[PDB]
Amino acid sequence: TLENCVFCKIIKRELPSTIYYEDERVIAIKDINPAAPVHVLIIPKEHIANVKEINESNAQILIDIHKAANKVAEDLGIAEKGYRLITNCGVAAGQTVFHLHYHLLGGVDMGPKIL
Amino acid sequence: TLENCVFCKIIKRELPSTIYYEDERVIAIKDINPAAPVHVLIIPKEHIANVKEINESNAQILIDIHKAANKVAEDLGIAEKGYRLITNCGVAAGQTVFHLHYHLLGGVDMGPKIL
Ligand SMILES: [Zn+2]
Numbered sequence A, B: 001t002l003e004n005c006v007f008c009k010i011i012k013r014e015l016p017s018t019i020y021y022e023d024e025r026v027i028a029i030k031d032i033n034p035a036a037p038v039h040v041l042i043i044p045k046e047h048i049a050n051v052k053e054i055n056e057s058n059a060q061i062l063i064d065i066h067k068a069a070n071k072v073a074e075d076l077g078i079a080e081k082g083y084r085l086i087t088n089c090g091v092a093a094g095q096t097v098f099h100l101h102y103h104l105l106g107g108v109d110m111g112p113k114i115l
């Protein structure tokens, strides 16, 4: 855990959340400034800055991350039409919370341009 | 392999490519219609439609995928400023080639809006 990390705080129940999935390794929460009708953040409980810090010792968390993305996509009714997953590394990529997460986005036709 | 899949063809050398990383499980190639100065597709050799088909039996490929994304991000000089990874499931999410891949995007400030 990092003292000053909003997601770490959310995990330890120092701030509120809307939690769509949870276990000892990962949590999935509602993004409070959604960029699409369904916008969930899939967050590993271990504080790691972004995917640049993933390596041989911790990489299994990617599995949990994608597992929970799929389960939540089903639970929230976007799985069949589909969805986008995004993770960012660094401020140039738009990262503003430096604790690894994927954005699960869905419920609107997002179309051709990915950027 | 699927007969009619462009990426499968690329892998079997029936079409050309610019290949930044390769082993028996994964390949990373240049996107020929780049959406950013660096735009690489990270593609598992096994033909799977998108991440909705990832499950307990095949999920280890996510690791290879993120490993190669990181190595290529370093090789191409975008790792330090950072980068975005994107994968899409379904036409509503903008998927047009139905063989699982991540887009590795970098070399330009992409900023706040992820969609
Ligand atoms: Zn944290």
Ligand SMILES: [Zn+2]
Binding pocket: B001, B002, B005, B006, B007, B008, B009, B046, B047, B048, B098, B099
């Ligand atoms: Zn294929």
